[PDB]
């Protein structure tokens, strides 16, 4: 619907979960999927295999818009990150750009205290 034909894939990879959101080029979301929402909750959702399954689902649910091309913006560390990009390429998308947007403070706010496990 509305046949945008190109957008952006935002990958929010963290240590516990990975979220894939596909937007147009104006930041309007079109579809999203998560590792946690693809089954295998718990320790299994922080895995590279977890991430690609989420990417495949997010590739679905936007086929109506007829996306052909898209940039990918990668944020944060985590076991996903690279796995999602491969899945999007395998899903039949023409990847044009690959940039990471991980927020890096110029040492501003104080982080939480170190875990004493």
């Amino acid at each position: 619907r509305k046949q945008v034909s190109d957008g952006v894939a935002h990958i929010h990879a963290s240590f516990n979960n990975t979220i894939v959101t596909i937007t147009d080029r104006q930041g309007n979301a079109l579809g999203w999927a998560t590792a946690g929402g693809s089954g295998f909750r718990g320790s299994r959702k922080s895995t590279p295999f977890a991430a690609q399954v989420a990417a495949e689902r997010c590739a679905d649910a936007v086929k109506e818009y007829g996306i052909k091309n898209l940039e990918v913006m990668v944020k944060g560390p985590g076991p996903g990150r690279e796995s999602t990009i491969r899945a999007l390429n395998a899903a039949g998308f023409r990847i044009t750009n690959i940039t990471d947007v991980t927020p890096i403070p110029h040492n501003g706010c104080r982080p939480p205290k170190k875990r004493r496990v």
């Binding site: 560390p77 990847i95 750009n97 690959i98 890096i104 104080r110 982080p111 939480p112 170190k114």
Partner: protein, 51 residues
């Protein structure tokens, strides 16, 4: 970071991240390090870096 890939491509080429902060900064900016821990980790880091 930013790669403007040309039409010949099968490899991600995501190598400027290791050439840049990537995860080194994230791993170290996630828990506070009291000033004296850094000074000590710095001092031992290159006390060992001697041959």
């Amino acid at each position: 970071i930013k790669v403007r890939e040309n039409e010949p491509f099968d490899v991600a080429l995501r190598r400027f991240k290791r050439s840049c902060e990537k995860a080194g900064v994230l791993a170290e900016v996630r828990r506070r390090e009291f000033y004296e821990k850094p000074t000590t980790e710095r001092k031992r880091a290159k006390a060992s870096a001697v041959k």
